[PDB]
Design a protein around this ligand. Structure first.
Ligand SMILES: CC(C)C[C@H](N)C(=O)N[C@H](C(=O)O)[C@@H](C)O
Ligand SMILES: [Mg+2]
Ligand code: NI
Length: 77
């Protein structure tokens, strides 16, 4: 019943510019939004990047994995 979130985890390989681009490409986010989330990943170690049903977050995780980003999902409490 609960809503879920997709989290992207910091990784030591992917370019900062790539991560900003992926968030725009996969989610349609604006450049300031994508950059903000990228920097949160890089400076906090992780960031919630999207939110919704468990099934919707399963798709976001799969899309992010195909892009090569470290994504997981968990219930939002
Ligand atoms: C947003 C995260 C994944 C950035 C990386 N931790 C990072 O430091 N990337 C570097 C960079 O963009 O210069 C190199 C390692 O790709
Ligand atoms: Mg929460
Ligand atoms: Ni880094």
């Amino acid at each position: 019943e609960a809503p879920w979130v997709t989290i992207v985890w910091d990784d030591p390989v992917n370019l900062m510019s790539y991560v900003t681009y992926v968030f725009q490409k996969l989610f349609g986010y604006s450049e300031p939004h994508a950059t903000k989330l990228m920097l949160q990943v890089h400076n906090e170690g992780k960031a919630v990047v999207s939110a919704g049903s468990r099934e919707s977050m399963e798709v976001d995780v799969s899309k992010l994995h195909a892009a090569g980003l470290w994504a997981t999902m968990q219930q939002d409490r």
